[PDB]
Amino acid sequence: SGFRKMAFPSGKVEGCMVQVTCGTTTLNGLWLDDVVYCPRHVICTSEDMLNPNYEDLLIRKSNHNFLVQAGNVQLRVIGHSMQNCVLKLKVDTANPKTPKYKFVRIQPGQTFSVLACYNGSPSGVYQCAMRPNFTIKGSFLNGSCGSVGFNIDYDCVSFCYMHHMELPTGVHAGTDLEGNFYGPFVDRQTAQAAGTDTTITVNVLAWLYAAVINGDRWFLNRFTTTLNDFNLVAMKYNYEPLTQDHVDILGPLSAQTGIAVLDMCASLKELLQNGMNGRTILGSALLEDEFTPFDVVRQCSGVTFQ
Amino acid sequence: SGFRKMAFPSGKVEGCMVQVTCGTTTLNGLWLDDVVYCPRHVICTSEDMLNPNYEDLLIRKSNHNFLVQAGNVQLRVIGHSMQNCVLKLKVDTANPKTPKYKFVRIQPGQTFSVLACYNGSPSGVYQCAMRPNFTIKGSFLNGSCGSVGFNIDYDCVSFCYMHHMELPTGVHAGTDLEGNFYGPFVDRQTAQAAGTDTTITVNVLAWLYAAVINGDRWFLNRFTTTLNDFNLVAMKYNYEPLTQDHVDILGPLSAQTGIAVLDMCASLKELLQNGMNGRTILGSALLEDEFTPFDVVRQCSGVTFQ
Ligand SMILES: [Cl-]
Residue B78 and residue B115 in one domain? no
Q: How many domains, chain A?
A: 3
Residue A150 and residue A295 in one domain? no
CB of B37 closer than 8 Å to CB of B172: no
The question of whether B128 is a catalytic residue gets the answer: no
Between the CA of B96 and the centroid of ligand 1 the distance, in Å, is 33
Task: Please tell me the distance in Å from B217's CA to the nearest CA on chain A.
Answer: 14
Nearest to B82 by CA among B37, B119, B28: B37
Residue B154 and residue B104 in one domain? yes
Nearest to A129 by CA among A293, A297, A260, A252: A293
Instruction: Flag whether B306 is in a domain.
Output: no
Instruction: Flag whether A285 is in a domain.
Output: yes
The Cβ of residue B291 has, within 10 Å, a number of other Cβ atoms equal to 26
DSSP β-ladder status, A100-103 and A86-91: unpaired
Between the CA of A4 and the centroid of ligand 1 the distance, in Å, is 4
Nearest to B265 by CA among B200, B197, B199, B201: B201
- Residues of A46-64 as b/e, b for ≥16 C-beta within 10 angstroms? eebeeebebeebeeeeeee
A181-187, long-range: CB < 8 A, 24+ apart: A181/A84, A181/A85, A181/A134, A182/A105, A182/A130, A182/A134, A182/A135, A183/A133, A183/A134, A183/A135, A184/A134, A185/A134, A187/A39, A187/A40, A187/A41, A187/A52, A187/A54, A187/A85
Residue A95 and residue A174 in one domain? no
Q: Do residue B6 and residue A140 have CB atoms under 8 angstroms apart? A: no
According to DSSP, the residues that pair with B124 across neighbouring strands are B116
Q: How far apart (Å, rounded) are the C-alpha atoms in residues B239 and B242?
A: 9
Q: Is the dihedral of CA B293, B298, B300, B301 positive or negative?
A: positive
| Domain boundary, last residue among B99, B130, B165 | B99
Between the CA of A254 and the centroid of ligand 1 the distance, in Å, is 23
Residue B139 and residue B6 in one domain? yes
Instruction: Flag whether B19 is in a domain.
Output: yes
Contact of B144 with chain A, judged by CB distance below 8 Å, is answered with yes
Which residue out of B28, B114, B123 would a mutagenesis test of the A interface target, given it has the greatest number of A Cβ atoms within 10 Å?
B123
Q: Do residue B304 and residue A15 have CB atoms under 8 angstroms apart? A: no
Instruction: Flag whether A56 is in a domain.
Output: yes
Q: Do residue A141 and residue B300 have CB atoms under 8 angstroms apart? A: yes
Between the CA of A238 and the centroid of ligand 1 the distance, in Å, is 24
Instruction: Flag whether B226 is in a domain.
Output: yes
Contact of B168 with chain A, judged by CB distance below 8 Å, is answered with no
| Domain boundary, last residue among A80, A99, A118 | A99
Nearest to B149 by CA among B170, B169, B131: B131
Burial class (CB in 10 A: 0-12, 13-18, 19+), B303: middle
3-state secondary structure of B297: helix
Instruction: Flag whether A243 is in a domain.
Output: yes
Cβ contacts of residue B2 below 8 Å, gap of 6+?
A137, A138, A139, A140, A166, A170, A172, B214
Residue A124 and residue A264 in one domain? no
Instruction: Flag whether A306 is in a domain.
Output: no
3-state secondary structure of B139: coil
Q: How many angstroms separate the most distant Cα atoms in chain A? A: 69
Cβ contacts of residue B81 below 8 Å, gap of 6+?
B87, B88, B90
Task: Please tell me the distance in Å from B150's CA to the nearest CA on chain A.
Answer: 13
Residue B108 and residue B9 in one domain? yes
Report CA-CA distances (Å) from B196 to B129, B133, B137, B193, B254. 16, 7, 14, 9, 31
What DSSP state is assigned to residue B206? H
Residue B179 and residue B222 in one domain? no
Solved how?
X-ray
CB of B91 closer than 8 Å to CB of B30: no
DSSP β-ladder status, B73-74 and B66-70: antiparallel
Q: Do residue B124 and residue A299 have CB atoms under 8 angstroms apart? A: yes
Helices (H), chain B: 11-14, 54-59, 201-213, 227-236, 244-249, 251-257, 261-274, 293-301
CB of B73 closer than 8 Å to CB of B129: no
Residue A107 and residue A142 in one domain? yes
Q: Do residue B125 and residue A302 have CB atoms under 8 angstroms apart? A: no
Burial class (CB in 10 A: 0-12, 13-18, 19+), A227: middle
Residue B141 and residue B7 in one domain? yes
CB of B107 closer than 8 Å to CB of B215: no
3-state secondary structure of B190: coil
Q: Closest-CA residue in chain B for A17?
A: B306
Residue A148 and residue A82 in one domain? no
Chain breaks in chain A (C to N over 2.5 A) after: none
All residues of chain A having their beta carbon less than 8 Å from the beta carbon of residue B297 are: none
Identify the domain containing residue A35 by its residue range: 15-99
The question of whether B41 is a catalytic residue gets the answer: yes
What DSSP state is assigned to residue B207? H
Q: Is the dihedral of CA B47, B50, B55, B56 positive or negative?
A: negative
Task: Please tell me the distance in Å from A11's CA to the nearest CA on chain B.
Answer: 4
If you compute the radius of gyration of chain B from its CA atoms, what whole number of angstroms results?
22
All residues of chain A having their beta carbon less than 8 Å from the beta carbon of residue B303 are: 123
Return the amino acid letter for A101. Answer: Y
User: Of A5, A124, A278, which is closest to B9 when you measure between CB atoms?
Assistant: A124
Q: How many CA atoms, within 13 angstroms, populate the side-chain half-sphere of residue A293?
A: 15
Instruction: Flag whether A281 is in a domain.
Output: yes
User: Of A123, A126, A285, which is closest to B305 when you measure between CB atoms?
Assistant: A123
All residues of chain B having their beta carbon less than 8 Å from the beta carbon of residue A284 are: 285-286
Contact of A50 with chain B, judged by CB distance below 8 Å, is answered with no
| Domain boundary, last residue among B142, B167, B197 | B197
All residues of chain B having their beta carbon less than 8 Å from the beta carbon of residue A118 are: 302, 304
Q: Is the dihedral of CA A304, B4, B5, B9 positive or negative?
A: positive
CA triple B191-B192-B198, angle to 5 deg: 140
All residues of chain A having their beta carbon less than 8 Å from the beta carbon of residue B174 are: none
State the catalytic residue, choosing from A16, A117, A145, A160: A145
Size of chain B in residues: 306
CB of A214 closer than 8 Å to CB of A299: no
Residue A173 and residue A70 in one domain? no
Which CATH number covers residue A43? 2.40.10.10
Could you tell me the resolution of this structure in angstroms? 1.8
All residues of chain A having their beta carbon less than 8 Å from the beta carbon of residue B171 are: 2
CA triple B13-B15-B21, angle to 5 deg: 100
- 3-state SS of chain A? CCCCCCECCCHHHHCCEEEEEECCEEEEEEEECCEEEEEHHHHCCCCHHHCCCHHHHHHCCCHHHEEEEECCEEECEEEEEEECCEEEEEECCCCCCCCEEEECCCCCCCEEEEEEEECCEEEEEEEEECCCCCCECCCCCCCCCCCEEEEEECCEEEEEEEEEEECCCCCEEEECCCCCECCCCCCCCCCCCCCCCCECHHHHHHHHHHHHHCCCCCCCCCCCCCHHHHHHHHHHCCECCCCHHHHHHCHHHHHHHCCCHHHHHHHHHHHHHHCCCCCCECCECCCCCCCCHHHHHHHCCCCCCC
Which CATH number covers residue A226? 1.10.1840.10
Return the amino acid letter for B195. Answer: G
